[PDB]
Amino acid sequence: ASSERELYEAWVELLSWMREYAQAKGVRFEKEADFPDFIYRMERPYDLPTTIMTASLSDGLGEPFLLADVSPRHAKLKRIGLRLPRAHIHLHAHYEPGKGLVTGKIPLTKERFFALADRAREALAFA
């Protein structure tokens, strides 16, 4: 319901992290997508806390090692997903009220995400 909001707020959060890691390691970031519902929004209420629907971390070859996508506004089954290229690792962030934002059921933290990132970055290291 309003789950939505905290999720969005979480999505920003996560994104923020993605940038941080990006700068931290100096690794390449690229915003991928923006909301359809921003484009074709044109007088109908927009209030999303960012404009960004999809964004990714790339190796420095334009090849991502990590993709990060939010669900759109009215697009049901609202979750945020991650997936590591060539790994078949598909992560489904739910939000759980009374907890926070959970990875399956385990609460996400930044470090979790960093660990995922480093193992990605270093392992797959396509370039």
Binding site: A33, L67, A75, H88
Partner: protein, 238 residues
Amino acid sequence: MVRVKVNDRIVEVPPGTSVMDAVFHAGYDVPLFCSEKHLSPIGACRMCLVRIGLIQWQPKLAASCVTAVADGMVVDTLSDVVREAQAGMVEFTLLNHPLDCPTCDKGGACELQDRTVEYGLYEKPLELPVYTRFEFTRRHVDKHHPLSPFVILDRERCIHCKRCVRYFEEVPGDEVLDFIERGVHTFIGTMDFGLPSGFSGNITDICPVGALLDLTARFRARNWEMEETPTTCALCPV
């Protein structure tokens, strides 16, 4: 030659031939996505599924194109059930096809697009339209990946055109691509990272979506606007 009747018209057309071609000769038509000129079919698009009588009717709609012909055959294409199904498959196709039309530069050449509008439309005279049954979030995957000094790749364009991968086998017999993950997780990639084949660029044309485009003319003009000037090459003695 083989005695074919597609619906209301009969044609001779020698044997070993695809139903499909006789269909088009007959001035009857179907949506088509997998198989292509100068290339061995596969069943993959499954768009050429018809029913046939020879006189009974198959219990499973065979890809006409893939099947050979038969004398005394009836081919049914104006089938109500076909049309419904066409739409069906269309919808299925559209499930993750990312919305990008205005900036899609497959565009006027989005044959896919044209089939959609040709053969699609909900089963219901309407008093209210329908558009979907889908509503869940789409897949989000790979884009803005330069594939080559000439070719940009934004992956979620692909319909799983298998055409290019196929091309590489059929035509040069030199391969550089492959499907990667399985099922829905799948997607085509290279591991050449820049394809050192002397023939490559034709895939742009082959790509029945806008995944492989000429970056050099990316965001420079629109499909319809161009004058497509048939003329002659001289850059090789061919």
